[model samples]
Target: MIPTEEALRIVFGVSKRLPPVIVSLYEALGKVLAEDIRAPDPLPPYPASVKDGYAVVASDGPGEYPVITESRAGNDGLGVTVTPGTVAYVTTGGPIPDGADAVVQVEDTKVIGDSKRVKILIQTKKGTDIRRVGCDIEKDATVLTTGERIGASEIGLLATAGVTMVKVYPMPIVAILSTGDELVEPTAGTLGRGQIRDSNRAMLVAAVMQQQCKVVDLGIVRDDRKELEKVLDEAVSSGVDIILTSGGVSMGDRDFVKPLLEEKGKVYFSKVLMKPGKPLTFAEIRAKPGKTVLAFGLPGNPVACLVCFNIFVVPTIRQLAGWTSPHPLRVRLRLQEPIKSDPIRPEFHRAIIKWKDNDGSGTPGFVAESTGHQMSSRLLSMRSANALLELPATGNVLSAGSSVSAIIVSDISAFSID
Candidate 1:
């Protein structure tokens, strides 16, 4: 057995990033850019107006000129040049008419009754309200840097820079499988004697998808040794980036996953010094010459499986997806109520943590309240939980007002931490 931190260090060391893939800008949201995107052309290829006004030669100065064609954004090519005695109606982003060195805002101009003539009421500079070529962005300028995450604003910026396609690190594809003959499908509706519905597979599958990765649900596998061996072989050979399994990992009589893992690949660690997930195991198999497939064995208990997933599996998934720093956010929170620790293993207690209005010292702070009984099998203990309170193994109990480290697992951006 190794410490949880040591196991995490090993997991990161063994994990490798996926190769880059080409995707359209629209489909690349939430993925990290693998290549730097440089602008192929200037933001505005032509001299354009920045406001709704009239384009005129500044030397024409404050006089009524012929009201010519409109220079709208799409059809900025009116083919008519603005001489010293002519003006053209222009809208925002419209190209400035040729020979027009300035623009007078519409508020400063007066129109004739026939609308055939407009007056420039104020003197304008040589280059007023005009965005010359390469003003906003120069050609070949870096628009998006490598390792930048793609978001909505990034999409708009890329579009403005005329980048339609991008190369980005793709999210990994995960395969989920559950073991044990006593477990039946939850969709089975009814259960026979000594049988329980399977909840880990769906929960695990949902967790995998929540990270935006493609997941294949291999369903449930029985405790049969030959069947389990075949399933493992098939998953590893299928080229899936990772395979997640629950049960048949501990020293139970029917535990065949560890033995099978030893036969086919290398098991880095089969135990961790942590409560609920003490029997967690990690292994790696060479899928090809330049590629590897990862496998994780979490306990069969529903709550333990989910907790271990958040702690161990997801970090590897993020690192393998090319994230520079893949660990979940660890925060120091003031405890709302007292908490107890196990006799030997460190405990990851489910809790609801939120930004408190005050810590009774006139300053805002983080506070946490537990989700009730924390047994590994209850599963209900995970309800309303946004964080995992990390309590040490040496202490029997901690005072209510003491501080503890928490691993943020759920979204708490909605403000009201209820």
Candidate 2:
């Protein structure tokens, strides 16, 4: 048995960030940048009009001026200078012609006689409504640093910086499998007396997919050692980055996962000081020299499987994909109700967490309320739970309004079911 932090250290020590690969910008969403992305040139690359109006010198305001030519986007301006008392009709994002110091919106000017001339209604200051060169970004400036996660806004910024392709850490390939003979596929028309549907694999597949890792489902294997060993050998032979198996890790007569792992690979630790997932097992299978595969043996209980994956496996996936911050998002929140502590092992109690406006004296910031009955086998306890209250192991009890650390595992909403 070991502490959670020690187990984490061991896991991270065995794992490392995957190699980088170059991908087109279209496929770079949600990937971590491996190299710094710099601006090819100053944003806009030239002086441009911020408004759809005439470009002219500010000193020639409040007077009628001849329209030199039209300047629309995607084309070089009229290629003629905006001489004094003359204006170039420019559209939004259009290049500013030479000798133009300001832009007056069409709303501020009215056409006089024919469409060849326009009358300025107000005096305009220099640089008004004009985007100066390098105003948004300077040439060679680092738009995105290495280790930055690419999101929609980052994608837009990269495109604006003329980045058509990017080098990023590739997503990992995870191989998922489930153990035990009592489990059957969900589509098994009818279940025999002692048989149950295999929900852990489906749930874990979704969980791994949500983490942005590709999943290869190895299906359910019986408790027989030969069958289990054959499946494990096949997975390892395929060279999967990570292997996740649910069930057959607890201390039971049919439990063969730990023994097989100890025989074929190196088991870092078989247990942790935590609730609902104490029998979690982590190991590394060395198929050959310099080539090793990480494996996690999660408890069979549906809730335990999901919780362990969120806390441990997800972080490993993120780290392998080159994410700098791989830990679950943590926040301090006040408890809405009292909670009892486990006498020995620490518990990750599922709860609904919400943010509240702060009072003058810090009355409210974020509040967490527990979901009903938090039994390890009761999967419904995770419904609407956005956070896991980090309750330490002790006999002491926590009262309402006490602040505690909570791991945010889901997208927070306004409020969750009480």
Question: Residue by residue across 285-318, what tens digits does model 2's lDDT show?
Answer: 9875456788999999988888888888988999
Which regions in candidate 2 have their CA more than 4 angstroms from the true location? Answer: 358-362, 413-418
Residues forming the 10-long window of minimal summed lDDT in candidate 2: 355-364
Judge candidate 1 against the unseen true structure and give its global Cα lDDT, from 0 to 1.
0.87
Best by lDDT: 2
Error of 1 at 407 (Å): 1.8
**How many clashing residue pairs, candidate 2?**
0
Query: What lDDT does the true structure give each of the candidates?
Result: 0.87, 0.88
Name the lDDT value of residue 226 in candidate 1. 96
